[PDB]
Each structure stands twice: as C-alpha cells, then as structure tokens.
Symmetry: C2
Subunit: 375 residues, 2 copies
C-alpha cells in the first residue's frame, strides 16, 4: 500500500472566523456585522450590499424574514473543521480567514489585529500537526511599513503558506501602482496569493426583483465576475510581467477567466489604442502565459464543464481542490453528515479526469502539496 | 456527400446600420450618436458610456483623440457585407440591426421607425437572394399593441427569421413580467430571439486606470457579463418555464453562462430562502435543461477552451458560427482582406471538434439552417 493507493487529499479553499474576529463583527453597525435576532437561534452574519435591504427591514419589524446567513459553529469551531474533514476524507486543509478579512478595520488598529489573528491561525494549525496550514491575512488599511512588517511576520510564521486577499487592495483596485512593492515583498517571501471575491458588482445590476432570488445572483454571478475583473485589470496593468515570481491562486476556478481568455486576447489584439501605443507587440506575454506560469486555479466550479475549461487553460498540474467550507451547508439534511457542496466538486473532478487517474490525484492533493510546500 | 464536400457556411452574428438609421443617429446629441470630426476621415459612432470622457474632450480640444469608433463603410454598405462574406467563404449571413437598436426612440414614433428599418432589411436581403436573412428589431418603447403589430409584421416579412433584442427589454430587464405577453407572441410566431448585450456594466467597475486599457474591459468582460446577468435573471424568474415555446440564441456563447451553470445550480440548491420557499426540488427545470431545450449559443468565443465548454453545456447541435462583423476590423492589415476576428473563431471550431467533422459542419452552418429555417 502506497501513496497512489492511499493518496493525500487536500482542501485549499476553506474558511474560518476566529473568536476575536467575531467579537469585532458583533460590535458593529455597518457592513460587515454579526447580529442576533429573536426568530433565528443563531446570530445572523451580514456581509453583502445585497443583504442590506433586508437588514433595514428586519430592524423595523420582528416578523420579517431574517437577514444575511446563519453564523453556525462551523465558522468558529476547529473541532468542527476537523469533523468536516474526517467525514469527507480530507487529509489536509489550508484554512483562511473569510471575506472581508481586515479590509474594513481602521488604519490604526489594523496591524495589531492582523498580528493577533495570524498568530491565532498558526496556533490552530498547531493543534493538529500535519493536517492544517493557512493563508494569512494582511492589514491593507495600515500604511506601507506595517504591511511590510506583517509580510515579514508571515514569512517567518509557522504553518503559513501564503496570504488571502480581496480585489480592492488599497481601495483603488489591484492595478493600483502603489500595490507593487507589496506584491514584490510577497513574491520574495515565497508567499502565494489566494485572491478571493467579496465586493461583487454594483447591487443595481441585479435589477428590481433581485430579492426574489435569495443570495443566488451575488454569490453565483457577482463573486466570480468580481474575480475576473480584478485579475484582468491586474493583467492589463502589467503586474505579471512586472512581478515575475508572483504566484496567485484564483478562487472559483478564476471566476470566468478560462472561458473569457480567448475573448480578452482578441480584444487586446483589436484595440486601436493598445496597438498604436505599442502595447500589442509580438513578444507580449498573453493571458495564457500567465495562466500557465504565474496563476493557479482552484477547482471550485461545481461541474465538469467549467472544470474541463479550467484544466484546458491552466493544465491539470495547476488545479487544486476546494470546498468553500462552511458557506454552503446542507439545509434539509444533517450539517454533521455529507455536504452536497463537496460532493458536487468531487463529482466534477471524477467526471472531468476520471476517478483515481493521475490527474485526479494531482487535483485532489498533489498539486497543492507541491505548490504550497505542505511539509 | 456533394453536400458534405461543399457545406453551406452560415454567419448568424452580423450587423448593419441602414442609411435611415444612421440619419437618426446623426441628428442626436446624446448616446447614441454619429457626428464628423476634423481629425479623422470617417465620422465617429458613439455607443458606449465609456466613450463619453473622450467625446467631451474632442469637442473642446482639436488635438485630442477622435472618440468612439470609426463609422466605416462596413457598417452601412451591403456590397461591403457581400465582400466580407466572399473573402471569408461565408455563404449566408443572418444580419441584424446593431445595438442599441431602437432603445432610445420615443414611444410615439418607435413603431413607424421599426416598420421602416425592418422593411429596409427585408429589401436588402432581397437584393442578394439566398445569401441574406435577418433578425428584425422591435419597438420596445412603444405600447404593447404596437409591439404586437410589429411582431405580426415580422412574422410575415420576407427573409425575417427572428428578432434581436437587448438585455433591458422594456427598461426594467428580462425578468419584467410585462415582457411575458411579448415573449409569448414571439414564441407563437416562431420568432427566435437573438439576445445581445449593449449596456455592459456600470463604468465605475473598471476603476480609475480604465482609460489606459482602451475598449478592452467593456468589450471583453462587460458585454458577456451583461448577457450572463440578463439570462440568469430571466431563468430565475421562471420565464423559460412559463413560455416553453420560446427559443433564444445567446451572443458570445452565453457570455460566461456555460462556465457558471454549475455554480448557479449549486447556489440555488443551497439558498436558505429558495429552499424555505419550496423552490428547490427534483422537478425543477435546471439551467442545463434550458441550455438543451430552449436556448442556443453562438460560437463567437475566440477560443477552443470556451467553445468546448459551450458544446459541453449545450451540445454541438446547438452551437452556431458567427463573426460579429463589422465590430472588430483589423487595425494593422487591409480591411478589405482577411480579418483575424474570423480566423480566431474558425480556428476555435477546428480545434474543438476537428476540421470537416460532422460537428464542424453543424456549427459552421447546418445548425443555423435547421433552427432558423434558412432553406
Ligand atoms: Zn470562499
Ligand atoms: Zn455584436
């Protein structure tokens, strides 16, 4: 019995909220916040602009449908994380703080809250040696020297393997030139970036009836689209050519990137301004080059259709399995049993590359172990 | 066999602006418009909200760049269309008014204008019998009775095989209940809808550096995303279930729809509100179902990666070749020659299904012929 018969399964897309972070979320009035209501036995976690028109309604009425999503024991409990892993035959998790990280924290307290949280994550991973690693979080509201010291901390921090971060960066996007030395620091520290959505799109794009459709529009369309816009702006700004040893893992198989790379390239090629400014040269690095050299994709796509396009774009050696625990728990079955949300992704892997093939082993664990040095 | 040795090639995504429509645009002072500028030989076509900052500058400073895009002969000339078709071995084009159609017209003249434009297309198609069919355009600002009159007219109109419409419908989107009687009327008349983007996303999402990126962001990401959002809204509101006879072709392979169908499905399944409201369950017609029964997809995706995803989601019998002429002319080479934007899609079909295979023949023309009754 050997490694191939009994492979190491790894989930690289799995979130927590440590107790301190909830303490902050509870003591808040604007997004993000956690607030207990009488009807639902669990505190309601409210994170999105779309959840707002339901919060302003459930504050002036105790009969109204509860806002946001349930804050369960799955967000905070580590034993809960381990239990989920054991039920789903996951061997190793790479845990990360969930959206919106520290992006709202005031510039002054940010650094210290960052240090505290990342220390906590490292302690958690310490509780189960071998099975836990983490993407740390950055205080991007803090000024440059705090940021750099934070990165230095992470690079020294046990069990750490990268950082997770959203698409606003320093408040101007990811193509913001002031971001560069931070990328450079990350790159030099060998800290892999897990880029992840949160802000989605302007709430108005969803139309008037949007509340009839639950969280579907913002979570299924808004998140992946946000990720695609972020990375495409990163790319058009030249961040990848400029910071060559930068390594990013995109949430939700790059959002819609694999599907649109063709279109992006064709649009570049055919852009009057871009060609006449000498930007469409023949030695240019394409979206495809970045997709094969600098960017990795998670396999959180829920179907072999998307998974197959993701694999086409990046290669099966650049895909990594995830679950997005615990944001999509079972409603009508036991939260302690099998999660449909996991089994869809496993099924997509199986249908895309075959059960037990070498590509399946790579996507289910090996790629992650190699790329994120999980020793 | 002779039919196989010499297949009919059909282009279903191709645009013109009739002389009369151009006139209407020429006397306008707000989007959309056409006016001449000293600095460029051809008048400028201004459609996008992204082109407004350049326009404001061009009026005030004669050394600034000419805003918008060249309104070339490719837009208004029929002979130029036939030339494009011959250069690229295209046997039949199903032509259509380009965005923004009649979305800007007053309710009281919309019907008269519509009738005039649709009649003109019919006349053009009549000029090269056998090689030209069109999607008509609808007076979507006019009152319901006028709409139905238009639909009745199109149903009878020589060379008409459907209608093209944008993603805003009557202003409030495609999940607007007032669209139902229009959808039903189109369905009953066998007018296939060609759903096409225009409004993209709020120009704010491209960020502060957007001007450095030419038209890439609004065209490469904005358009296909607008399409995805429109169809997703239409699907979640039950439109497809309510009008079972409805047939829609989606522009740009459904935007990003095939890559996201899985995600949408998992999100519906896991939505607290939708489950509580009893909308989840196993007799629900899925996105997948809709993609195989009601919705067709054009092949304007520029890459085999995406095209394979589209075929996976809809089947090779539901994909149709298109060029998007004349929106992406070569910049570097002669515009009377070969267009890279045709070459790229041709190559996508070739690499996705194999040259000369039955699937290639179907996508490149047989599908259109069967679905749009071009014989
Ligand atoms: Zn997540
Ligand atoms: Zn078009």
């Amino acid at each position: 019995s050997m490694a191939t018969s009994n492979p190491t399964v790894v989930d690289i897309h799995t979130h927590m909220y440590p107790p301190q972070y909830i303490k902050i979320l509870e003591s808040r009035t604007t997004i993000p916040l956690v607030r207990k209501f009488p009807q639902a036995p669990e505190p309601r976690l409210i994170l999105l602009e779309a959840e707002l028109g339901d919060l302003e309604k459930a504050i002036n009425d105790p009969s109204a449908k509860p806002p946001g999503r349930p804050l369960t024991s799955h967000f905070a409990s580590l034993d809960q994380k381990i239990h989920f892993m054991d039920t789903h035959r996951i061997d190793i998790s790479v845990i990360s703080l969930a959206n919106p990280w520290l992006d709202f924290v005031h510039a002054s307290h940010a650094g210290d809250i960052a240090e505290s949280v990342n220390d906590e994550f490292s302690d958690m991973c310490g509780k189960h040696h071998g099975r836990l690693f983490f993407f740390g979080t950055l205080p991007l509201t803090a000024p440059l020297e705090t940021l750099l010291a934070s990165i230095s901390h992470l690079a020294a921090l046990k069990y750490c393997r990268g950082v997770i971060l959203g698409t606003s960066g320093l408040g101007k996007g990811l193509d913001d030139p002031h971001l560069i030395p931070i990328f450079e620091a990350l790159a030099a520290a060998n800290l892999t970036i897990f880029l992840h959505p949160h802000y989605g799109l302007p709430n108005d794009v969803w139309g008037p009836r949007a509340g009839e459709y639950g969280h579907v529009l913002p979570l299924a369309l808004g998140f992946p689209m946000e990720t695609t816009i972020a990375v495409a702006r990163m790319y058009l700004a030249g961040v990848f050519d400029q910071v060559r040893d930068l390594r990013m893992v995109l949430a939700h198989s790059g959002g819609t990137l694999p599907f649109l790379a063709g279109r992006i390239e064709s649009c570049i090629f055919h852009d009057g301004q871009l060609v006449r400014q000498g930007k469409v040269g023949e030695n240019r690095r394409t979206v495809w080059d970045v997709l094969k050299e600098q960017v990795y994709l998670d396999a959180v796509i829920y179907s072999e259709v998307g998974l197959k396009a993701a694999i086409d774009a990046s290669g099966s050696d650049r895909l990594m399995f995830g679950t997005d625990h615990p944001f999509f728990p079972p409603i009508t079955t036991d939260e302690q049993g099998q999660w449909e949300s996991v089994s869809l992704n496993a099924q997509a892997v199986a249908e895309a590359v075959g059960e037990g093939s070498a590509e399946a082993r790579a996507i289910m664990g090996s790629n992650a172990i190699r790329v994120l040095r999980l020793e």
